[PDB]
Amino acid sequence: PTLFVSYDQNGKKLSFANWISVLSPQDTPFVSMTGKESINQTIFSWQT
Amino acid sequence: NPTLFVSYDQNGKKLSFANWISVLSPQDTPFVSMTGKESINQTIFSWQT
């Protein structure tokens, strides 16, 4: 059991990163540039 | 269609309901009003005639 190296080590301590990567976009410009109106479901309508 | 002054062809009318629901029904409970309250714990007892 000589040739002591990481392959032979035991009880090691990891070196992970304390964060997570995310690249999924979150722009959504349409929903932000429209505007919401109100309650009162389709009982009303545009009628133009 | 502006052909004639009628209501059948009106676009975008108003439903014009009445704001009330007169669905009255009888509810008196005279017996239950002239009995009282004798709250109990269990449901197997008696009254020892």
Question: What is the rounded distance in angstroms from the CA atom of residue A45 to the CA atom of residue A37?
Answer: 13
Distance from CA of B31 to the nearest CA of A (A): 45
Rg (CA), chain A: 29
Using the Cα atoms of residue A48, residue B1, residue B7 and residue B8 in order, give the sign of their dihedral: negative
- All residues of chain A having their beta carbon less than 8 Å from the beta carbon of residue B11 are 47
Question: What is the rounded distance in angstroms from the CA atom of residue B22 to the CA atom of residue B42?
Answer: 42
Question: What is the rounded distance in angstroms from the CA atom of residue B18 to the CA atom of residue B25?
Answer: 20
Question: What is the rounded distance in angstroms from the CA atom of residue B30 to the CA atom of residue A33?
Answer: 63
| Resolution at which this structure was determined, Å | 3.4
* Cβ A48 vs Cβ B12: under 8 Å: no
- All residues of chain B having their beta carbon less than 8 Å from the beta carbon of residue A45 are 12
